[PDB]
């Protein structure tokens, strides 16, 4: 079935400008930030 981009529109719950963010450790994860700190967003199969 696959996977989809985070669509991090609503996942912060405070500070509405909720964005996606690039994280590297050359291994990259998606994070979600607004103002301070970062979040997630999910789905399953």
């Amino acid at each position: 079935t696959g996977s989809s981009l985070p669509d991090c529109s609503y996942a912060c719950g405070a500070c509405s400008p909720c964005k996606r963010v690039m994280i590297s450790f050359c291994s990259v994860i998606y994070r979600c930030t607004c103002r301070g700190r970062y979040y997630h967003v999910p789905s399953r199969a």
């Binding site: 996942a11 970062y38 997630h40 967003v41 999910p42």
Partner: protein, 363 residues
């Protein structure tokens, strides 16, 4: 162009308000504006249903919505998520440390994972938690529950993981015959009685941790039947009796610790630990063990750690400990061993303090 089911959406609204997160109300549709901890699955009619509901925060990423420590509660509205497959609460409290709600029963067929970890929950375990026949993973670790463990728990024909650690649970260990059960963790409880026989009928078991309880009686003879068992941890209990005739069937067993069973007072038979290639950790310290250091502990290939301290072992150290350079921790301290020690210099230099021999009178 898919839209969610309305009563499940209102159930999500009430649940989210109840936990303290009013922000989920502005949402124009719960299953398209997904936050971490809510999952949805559409059925054949392009209609989303809610499948996972999780709080609070183990950290930031994974950051589920936390709950109000001074205000939150568990809404009855959970009963309206007809497809809720997993429910997760971690370090989410309530206004007043409450009980485990009984209405968690009413979603029996769908729910396959119920985690209520470190919530400060008070009081006994609702019996109707058994009506969740289809449960695969049950976790109530580190609550404040007391009273019995419901018998309704043998209604989990398909359970996989059961973790009840950190409670005041009283009574005896369940008479479970749960074929699929893998990890059974009842440690740090007040459960008494003996190790029930039914247990060894659950062949699938790999972790059995009953530490820091008050379980009594000897250890089952038929514990060979647990031929998948990886780890067996029975420390700080009231166990007694004679060592089982054989544990040979217990291949893949990697770690066994009977530490702190002060009334054990039995010797270790030569043939007890013969065919244990995979055995790694053996803690038998502070168990009033009598007798002489058996030498079939030398032929344990994978043995890394052997604790026998604070016992009443007697005699010489067997010469065949010269034939052992694999161990990384060997505690024979605080016994009454007589003969002077036969350890080589390779071993003594490498081990250093990790070899304990003090408080033996005869050496």
């Amino acid at each position: 162009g898919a839209r969610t089911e309305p009563d499940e959406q209102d159930a999500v609204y009430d649940i989210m308000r109840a936990t303290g997160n009013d922000w989920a109300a502005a949402i124009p549709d719960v299953c398209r504006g997904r936050w971490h901890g809510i999952e949805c699955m559409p059925d054949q009619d392009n209609v989303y249903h809610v499948v996972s509901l999780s709080f609070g925060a183990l950290s930031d990423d994974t950051a589920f919505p936390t709950c109000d420590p001074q205000r939150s509660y568990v809404s009855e509205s959970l009963t309206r998520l007809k497809h809720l497959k997993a429910l997760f609460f971690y370090r989410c409290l309530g206004r007043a440390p409450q009980r485990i709600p009984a209405f968690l029963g009413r979603l029996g067929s769908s729910l396959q994972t119920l985690v209520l970890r470190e919530n400060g929950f008070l009081g006994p375990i609702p019996d109707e938690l058994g009506n969740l026949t289809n449960l695969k993973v049950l976790d109530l670790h580190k609550n404040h529950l007391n009273g019995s463990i419901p018998l309704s728990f043998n209604r989990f024909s398909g359970l996989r993981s059961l973790d009840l650690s950190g409670n005041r649970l009283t009574g005896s260990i369940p008479g479970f015959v749960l074929p699929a059960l893998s990890v059974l963790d009842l440690n740090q409880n007040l459960l008494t009685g003996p190790v029930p026989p039914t247990l060894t009928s659950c062949g699938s078991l790999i972790k059995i941790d009953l530490s820091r309880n008050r379980v009594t009686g000897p250890i089952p003879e038929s514990i060979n039947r647990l031929n998948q068992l990886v780890l067996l941890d029975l420390s700080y209990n009231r166990l007694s009796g004679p060592f089982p005739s054989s544990l040979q069937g217990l291949n893949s067993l990697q770690a066994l610790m009977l530490k702190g069973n002060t009334k054990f007072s039995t010797t270790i038979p030569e043939n007890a630990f013969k065919g244990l290639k995979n055995l790694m950790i053996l803690v038998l310290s502070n168990t009033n063990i009598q007798g002489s250091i058996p030498k079939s502990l030398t032929r344990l290939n994978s043995l890394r750690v052997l604790h026998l301290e604070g016992n009443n072992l007697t005699g010489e150290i067997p010469l065949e400990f010269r034939d052992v350079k694999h161990l990384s921790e060997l505690r024979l301290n605080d016994n009454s061993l007589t003969g002077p020690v036969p350890f080589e210099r390779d071993t003594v230099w490498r081990m250093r303090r990790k070899l304990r021999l003090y408080n033996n009178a005869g050496l």
